[PDB]
Design a protein around this ligand. Structure first.
Ligand SMILES: Nc1nc2c(ncn2[C@@H]2O[C@H](COP(=O)(O)OP(=O)(O)O)[C@H]3OP(=O)(O)O[C@H]32)c(=O)[nH]1
Ligand SMILES: O=c1[nH]cnc2c1ncn2[C@@H]1O[C@H](COP(=O)(O)O)[C@@H](O)[C@H]1O
Ligand SMILES: O=CN(O)CC(=O)O
Ligand SMILES: [Mg+2]
Length: 431
């Protein structure tokens, strides 16, 4: 297909950055359509690492125009910190990254709000990345937030910023009894980059339309993951945006009928960062093994990721929610050496019933127990394997069983972090 969507099928960190970097070799455009700098991805080429947050995972290819669509909540500081890091590395960010004037702005006070509230929640805290993503989407939806296009008129922006900061500070001081955020500083800081921000503005919805008509390849990149979706996730232990496939059209401006192939990034085991339901979570040695072997640490906060087996019941919600066309199985190599691997095939409900559908809100996951299928592991090293022939029979069975359980094929297999430690059985663009 011309327009390919690549998102997380679990709880984020499935390996989207690497895959987007890899597949963008044929694309003209790459588009982030939701989230903000809460996302954190580690790309690796010839051993060289690059960690992205707000910048799309195709920023390393000059033949590709990276774009942050209207759905993304944009942090000027974050953007500036990333542009500079890459520029000092030979990536002329400014000339390949375009952005939507509609993107909501994440300013200092949103971080204060994020923190104040998270502390207010006490024990029931969400475990957010402290990037102020929540408060940004809140201001947006309330129709009081600031967007990129507001910088078009510096004078009126400053006024809008004064009264809004006024609004939020009353809450920070009086209600939360927290430090107020200084207006003059946020204004200065922002104005310091106003011209850089505006220079990258393009009418992305119309752009994508023109691109579509010409038949150009577009790769849409999702942040976080399906079970973190604001509507369809383990509410309230979710993020504030639609991490699923529908977020593509809302936060880009492209029409829904123009999604040709949706690829879901599936990690061979499961992880979750932040509080919330995690049926197949492991707390034993295998949990430590996984975290250790798959170096599971938040690329944004550095927090240790909760690990567990792969949940095919949960993956099957992702399948239907995103109308997946295919999967990209990642970190197969991390399972190398386990005596046995397990797949969650159903849920034992607290009342006794066995089901193969996931509950919706976090509370309804309360007594849910995982029912697994146990399969034999493999001692051979798959790391670096770029062809199935190098994959052991157990590994091939695991892969095959997942396809059987989900009904969706594994078109791409990833056996290592580096860009080329991958197996492409079916390329989404010509598939
Ligand atoms: N062994 C192995 N490692 C892989 C693979 N894919 C990604 N990583 C490793 O997993 C991490 C991917 O970044 P993320 O935050 O986890 O994912 P996302 O883009 O969805 O947020 C990175 O950390 P990293 O070690 O430097 O190399 C990468 C893979 O197939 N095998
Ligand atoms: O990009 C991400 N990767 C993985 N987990 C994330 C990511 N962004 C948010 N989360 C989790 O989503 C929840 C809400 O975070 P927020 O998006 O910072 O408001 C917390 O559990 C986060 O840890
Ligand atoms: O890469 C993103 N992380 O896993 C989120 C975090 O560090 O909190
Ligand atoms: Mg990540």
């Amino acid at each position: 297909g011309n327009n390919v969507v690549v998102l997380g099928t679990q709880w984020g960190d499935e390996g989207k950055g690497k895959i987007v970097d890899l597949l963008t070799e044929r694309a003209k455009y790459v588009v982030r359509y939701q989230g903000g700098h809460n996302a954190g991805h580690t790309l690796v080429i010839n051993g060289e690492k690059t960690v992205l947050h707000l910048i799309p995972s195709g920023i390393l290819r000059e033949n590709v125009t990276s774009i942050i669509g209207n759905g993304v909540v944009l942090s000027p500081a974050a953007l500036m910190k990333e542009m500079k890091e890459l520029e000092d590395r030979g990536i002329p960010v400014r000339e390949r990254l375009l952005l939507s004037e509609a993107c909501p702005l994440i300013l200092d006070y949103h971080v204060a709000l994020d923190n104040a509230r998270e502390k207010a929640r006490g024990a029931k805290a969400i475990g957010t990345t402290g990037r102020g993503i929540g408060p940004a989407y809140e201001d947006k939806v309330a129709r009081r937030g600031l967007r990129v296009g507001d910088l078009f008129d510096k004078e009126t922006f400053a006024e809008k910023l004064k009264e809004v900061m006024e609004y939020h500070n009353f809450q920070l001081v009086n209600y939360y009894k927290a430090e107020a955020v200084d207006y003059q500083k946020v204004l200065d800081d922002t104005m310091a980059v106003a011209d850089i921000l505006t220079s990258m503005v393009v009418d992305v919805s119309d752009l994508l339309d023109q691109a579509r008509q010409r038949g150009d390849f577009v790769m849409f990149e999702g942040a976080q993951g399906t079970l973190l979706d604001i509507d369809h996730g383990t509410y309230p232990y979710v993020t504030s945006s639609n991490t699923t496939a529908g977020g593509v059209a809302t936060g880009s401006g492209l029409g829904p009928r123009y999604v040709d192939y949706v690829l879901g990034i599936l990690k061979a085991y499961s992880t979750r960062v932040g509080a919330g339901p995690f049926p197949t979570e492991l707390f034993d040695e295998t949990g430590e093994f996984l975290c250790k072997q798959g170096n599971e640490f938040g690329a944004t906060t550095g927090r240790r990721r909760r690990t567990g087996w792969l949940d095919t019941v949960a993956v099957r919600r992702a399948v239907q929610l995103n109308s997946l066309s295919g999967f990209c199985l990642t970190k197969l190599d991390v399972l190398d050496g386990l005596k046995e691997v397990k797949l969650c095939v159903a849920y034992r409900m607290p009342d006794g019933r066995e089901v193969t559908t996931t509950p919706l809100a976090a509370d309804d996951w309360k007594g849910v127990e995982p029912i697994y299928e146990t399969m034999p592991g493999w001692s051979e090293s798959t790391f670096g394997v770029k062809d199935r022939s190098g994959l052991p029979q157990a590994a091939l069975n695991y892969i095959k069983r997942i396809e059987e359980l989900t009904g969706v094929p594994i078109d791409i297999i990833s056996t290592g972090p580096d860009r080329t430690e991958t197996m492409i059985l079916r390329d989404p663009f010509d598939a």
